[PDB]
């Protein structure tokens, strides 16, 4: 891959993300700044466990269909076979939604945007899984410390999808060829404007998988 192809690949990844960002950063920080009142937070707490999972699953499902639209717009993804297309999405689509919900978590007050205002993990007590909500708050609190830009998570969410390990993979080599073209493209745009020590950390590994636990599996039952 030549020099100018990497620059055209980097441009296409952020081009796909800016169209599939779903909420656009600007309004997320614009409503920092609008926090649920004490009467409003109890209204969400007062909802039944079924009522709140039915809302959260609708949020989760609608956020994944943007991730697929993100995946369908990458330069190179559609060139893989559709067997590899599903199996990369099945494994990764939920993993990037957490990485995308990094946007609209506010590390100043430890709150998260949800349906118009900013809440905090006591907003989601109706799910009955405070251990899972607390630990995704910990995940987003770690991402916010790196001060991720818009084009930076565009590349990063693409590398979470394009993983050439996984289970299945008919054209395993064709995945590695696209993965290599994106991870060098990630380090190229990174070397420009000198942000080289957000790479030395970048978790270690495995915690991104650990929070896709047995609470958010199947989950068809909800309307």
Site pattern 133..152 for ligand 8A4 (x: CB under 6 A): x--x----------------
Least separation, in Å, of the C-beta of 72 and ligand 8A4? Answer: 17
Residues 55-114 touching ligand 8A4, rule: CB under 6 A, are 56, 59-60, 63, 94, 97, 100-101, 103-104, 112-114
Encoded tokens for 140: 């987003």
Task: Please answer whether residues 153 and 137 qualify as being in contact, where contact means their C-beta atoms are separated by less than 8 angstroms.
Answer: no
Least separation, in Å, of the C-beta of 87 and ligand 8A4? Answer: 18
Encoded tokens for 18: 């800016």
Encoded tokens for 88: 């990369």
- The Cα–Cα gap between 57 and 113 comes to 16
Site pattern 16..35 for ligand 8A4 (x: CB under 6 A): ------xx------------
Tell me the three state secondary structure of residue 6: helix
* CB of 55 or CB of 188, closer to ligand 8A4: 55
- The Cα–Cα gap between 3 and 23 comes to 32
* CB of 112 or CB of 159, closer to ligand 8A4: 112
Does position 211 interact with ligand 8A4 (CB under 6 A)? The reply is yes
Region near ligand 8A4 per CB under 6 A, out of 83-91, 154-162, 195-203, 208-216:
208-216
* CB of 74 or CB of 101, closer to ligand 8A4: 101
- The Cα–Cα gap between 213 and 215 comes to 6
Give all strands (DSSP E) within the chain, no chain letters. 105-106, 111-114, 117-118
Chain centroid offset of residue 34 CA: 23
Does position 126 interact with ligand 8A4 (CB under 6 A)? The reply is no
C-beta nearest to ligand 8A4: residue = 216
User: Which is nearest to 208 in space by CA: 159, 164, 175, 171?
Assistant: 159
Least separation, in Å, of the C-beta of 37 and ligand 8A4? Answer: 17
Q: Residue 34: what are its φ and ψ, rounded to 5°?
A: -140, 100
- The Cα–Cα gap between 90 and 166 comes to 10
Tell me the three state secondary structure of residue 105: strand
First and final C-alpha spacing in the chain? 47
* CB of 11 or CB of 22, closer to ligand 8A4: 22
Residues 153-192 touching ligand 8A4, rule: CB under 6 A, are none
Does position 41 interact with ligand 8A4 (CB under 6 A)? The reply is no
The residues binding ligand 8A4 (CB under 6 A) are 22-23, 56, 59-60, 63, 94, 97, 100-101, 103-104, 112-115, 124, 133, 136, 211-212, 216
């Amino acid at each position: 891959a030549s020099l100018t192809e990497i620059e055209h690949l980097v441009q296409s990844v952020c081009k796909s993300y800016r169209e599939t960002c779903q909420l656009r950063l600007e309004d997320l920080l614009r409503q920092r700044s609008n926090i649920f009142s004490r009467e409003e937070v109890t209204g969400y707490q007062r909802k039944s466990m079924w009522e709140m999972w039915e809302r959260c699953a609708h949020h989760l499902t609608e956020a994944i269909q943007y991730v697929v639209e993100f995946a369908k717009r990458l330069s190179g993804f559609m060139e893989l076979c559709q067997n590899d297309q599903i199996v990369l999405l099945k494994a990764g689509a939920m993993e990037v939604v957490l990485v995308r919900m990094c946007r609209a978590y506010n590390a100043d007050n430890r709150t998260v945007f949800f349906e118009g205002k900013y809440g905090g993990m006591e907003l989601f007590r109706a799910l009955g899984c405070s251990e899972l909500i607390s630990s995704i708050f910990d995940f987003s609190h770690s991402l916010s410390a790196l001060h991720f830009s818009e084009d930076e998570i565009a590349l990063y969410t693409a590398l979470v999808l394009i993983n050439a390990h996984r289970p299945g993979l008919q054209e395993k080599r064709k995945v590695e060829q696209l993965q290599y073209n994106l991870e060098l493209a990630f380090h190229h745009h990174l070397c420009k404007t000198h942000r080289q020590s957000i790479l030395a950390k970048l978790p270690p590994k495995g915690k991104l998988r650990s929070l896709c636990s047995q609470h958010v599996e199947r989950l068809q039952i909800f309307q």
